[PDB]
Ligand binder design. Structure first.
Ligand SMILES: [Ca+2]
Length: 124
């Protein structure tokens, strides 16, 4: 399965949308939902590398958040963290962003970032 909607990019069995324009995290979450995807989940180094190659230099929202501040970071699709790419010292805790390096930072959810990444399953 490697088919994606127009404007989305395939990697492996998924499709990705590199969104641009100011969003706080929840607004990015809904922006992805409006296009029938979700804020991206990341489950391998190879997926991460694909994303880093396209990462906004001024940071991007991804689909990880410290749910109900129950203290566990969980992906928006409900999957759990098995792969991680935290920047040194992170998480400091919120909502998670990807730096230009691809590394992750937990941040205030009301922070305004210029980019955000969505995913969905590729069709076959
Ligand atoms: Ca942090």
């Amino acid at each position: 399965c490697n088919t994606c909607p127009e404007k989305w990019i395939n990697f492996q069995r998924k499709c990705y949308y590199f969104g641009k324009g100011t969003k706080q995290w929840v607004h990015a979450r809904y922006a992805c939902d409006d296009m029938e995807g979700q804020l991206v989940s990341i489950h391998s180094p190879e997926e991460q590398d694909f994303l880093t190659k396209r990462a906004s230099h001024t940071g991007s929202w991804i689909g990880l958040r410290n749910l109900d501040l129950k203290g566990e970071f969980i992906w928006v699709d409900g999957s759990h963290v098995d792969y991680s790419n935290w920047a040194p010292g992170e998480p400091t805790s919120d909502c998670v962003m990807m730096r230009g390096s691809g590394r992750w930072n937990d941040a205030f959810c009301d922070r305004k970032l210029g980019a955000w990444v969505c995913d969905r399953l590729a069709t076959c």
